[model samples]
Target: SKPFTLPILTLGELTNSRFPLPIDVLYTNPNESAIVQCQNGRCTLDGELQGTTQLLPTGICAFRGKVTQQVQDEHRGTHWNMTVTNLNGTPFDPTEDVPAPLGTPDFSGQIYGVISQRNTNTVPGEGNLPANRAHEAVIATYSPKFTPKLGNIQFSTWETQDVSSGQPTKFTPVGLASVDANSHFDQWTLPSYSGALTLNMNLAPSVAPVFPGECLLFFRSFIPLKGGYGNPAIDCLMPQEWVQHLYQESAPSLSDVALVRYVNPETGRTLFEAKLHRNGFLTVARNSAGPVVAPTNGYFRFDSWVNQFYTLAPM
Candidate 1:
């Protein structure tokens, strides 16, 4: 299993405002950890206040502000700065003093946020739990503050089963969840005082074991925007560390090449076929070009797993 990196591109809108403030939230592989940078935590659109900034204690960030709100409310006096440490669920301290962003310095505000919290609801030694469990869960969330409720955000899911079987099968469209709008923030367990529309998801356990030759799971979201709807979609997967598994085993006998088809999980479209050469080597047919030898040093060559999705490569 090779580790995968999923990109979560986000955009923000300041309704009724005269200026445009762009927001960028980035999440990396594995933990889906994120770095949230929003311009003017306090901004006004038209005659209304759109966003705001808050004071916090040491070892806390914006992502988990609710976790430290008790202290923030109990003892406070406009404390603007706090020593942020790895606490709550955030991965890093956004306030930590680091060199300017490569070429651009003082570009924006980087705040800590809980992109997706892993749910600890699995039995001991359970390899793969339900879709709602935090282990197989993958979430891509975004929040743009100081704006009107995000108009109706749409969400859905897809699944493909019996992947190892060579027969052609389409990825079944499973409409799991939908939304009318980001009406409130309290719904997601964040501070209700702070204003922002948040969207988050935890892949349901009913669509579990999204793996090679078994099933592949995907989730999508369509955000309503003033300029245009920001519709984003991505598969539910993580950085799979390099792990080896026996693909095929047979006694050397009459030789024959095995042709394999890898389908597109989103549309059930076939991308290409993997060829298992009689000589125990592997290759692929991306287009109508037939089969092409996988490039490699003489000593090391292609293996059967190369043509499979969720295996060694992205299909």
Candidate 2:
């Protein structure tokens, strides 16, 4: 196929696969008029307006959310499978009047979901921060590691950080503890010696720090147990971009899903959107696109991480 200018991506939802490239989750949005200007090597996005959506009590910030990132791609100019950076955002909190997630100077990190499309053993985008700041945060929360070819359990990547030079250096036992998988039939035909595997983890203090101004999350590691042939396809994980901080001593429960809520005060309904980037950031300007309907004073939450939809009334 000839290389052509990829059109603007309007409505997009973050995926939940592995240490994914931000572009992996770039899907089509329902907001038709809202389109992103992505070409050359950079992308700029702006939120759409809720013209007939709302005007009072909740105010009119219409579409409220943002994502950003700067990193290399596996195959230059593909726009799809480029290794991404950690996800970032503003204060995507409702309940209050003022918005925050991606508001300039005082921003924070977020985790949306997987790095690629859904299902299938497709590797999404991947990349680390200046010192693995983004990768470290992810491990701290989910605690993923390389899986053994033949074992009784899955483990988190055994890692170490050296700060002798005043800067942190991440060291993995097997150069990033990545694992290979065994096909399902072969796993069982090992015969009956094989079985499906599950993932697990616990809290470790020494493995946390430097919250990389983001919340968009992705899981990438050596997963065990595969199916079919060709590449011994391992398990794939992609949840949807979300956010949190595990190193905080005070707010243990502060970590929650980050998302944008567009309320139609006229009808009392609300529409939600999330800006997800594994190692990238995108911003939807306040004055950007269309206006959609929502679910009244009740909250209609869109969980990009798990593709789960939620509905609740004012508390």
Candidate 3:
């Protein structure tokens, strides 16, 4: 599997008297971690107060609060909530100091509000555990006076399932990802690959008895425009090093020519093909005009072929 980086919450300062602070919350084990409170330009981590200079650059802070879950009969399910105990080293009053954009003079003083939720009861199928465990979990942020300075902030969580005993067991959070107001999942823009290609190697000696020197590459994009219709499947025969490089490395070196063909999975017929060459240049065989190359310090718009597009750049 390719390596993935987790997401972090960023807190920026306000132009007004209010200061934005990062509060870290742990859902799995809240009692083990202590909550750090930042107030009046000073932050307390462990009973010690530190000045604004101690804060990270640009007044940005990461969430470090604790979350507690409760069971209620009326709700018929588990309820999760967290409260801000203090602000600026003083006792927090929900009526007086409410979260911005949510709290107002007319309607304020709510004890708890839902930040995010997910349905984790669904059972995952075999060999699809990685995709099933990927999730984006939401966390609350404080904005002042019904005017929010916070834009789209994203947070993700990964759950791992234990299935060594022939039965799938509990799932636990391993990491996080970014979030936004409009989307529950992270969206990658231009200059980045909009989708992923999963290459699986079949090394069954009982079926062939000899090394096939080939692997199946599965390409799919969650975005609608890129690959919403169906997955583009392909079978490529390449050296063992090339297969390992594509599977493991984040940026694989393609100094030599590597041919990749798109094939219809059901019909098993070749549809189209492209070549990846030195310095990350790709040239489609059908688009016989010229090799698509990246501009100086820019990305390559490899979209000459119909219903196909890829953005590539030199490492």
Give stretches of model 3 more than 4 Å off.
1-136, 139-181, 184-186, 189-218, 221-257, 264-269, 277-315
lDDT tens readout by residue for model 3, 80-194: 2222222122333334322211111111111111122222344467333331222223221221211111211212122222111112111121111122232222211100101
Q: Rank the candidates by lDDT, best first.
A: 3, 1, 2
Please list the residue runs of candidate 2 whose C-alpha ends up more than 4 Å from where it truly belongs after superposition.
1-17, 23-269, 272-315
Better of 1 and 2 by lDDT: 1
Q: What's the best-to-worst order under TM-score?
A: 3, 1, 2
Q: lDDT of candidate 3?
A: 0.21
TM-score of 1: 0.19
**How close to the true structure is residue 71 of candidate 1, measured as C-alpha lDDT?**
14
For residues 1-315, write the lDDT of model 1, one tens digit per residue.
Answer: 332111221112101010111111111122222222221111111111112211111211122111111111121121111112223333332233321110110111111111222233445566755222111110112223211111111111122121111111111111112222442111112221112433322111121222333222111122222222323222211110100011112223222433444333445444434444332223332212111122111111122333233332332
Q: Distance (Å) between predicted and true CA of 217, model 2?
A: 14
Q: Among these predicted structures, which one has the highest TM-score?
A: 3
Candidate achieving the largest lDDT: 3
Once all C-alphas are superposed, what RMSD does model 3 give against the true structure? 23.6
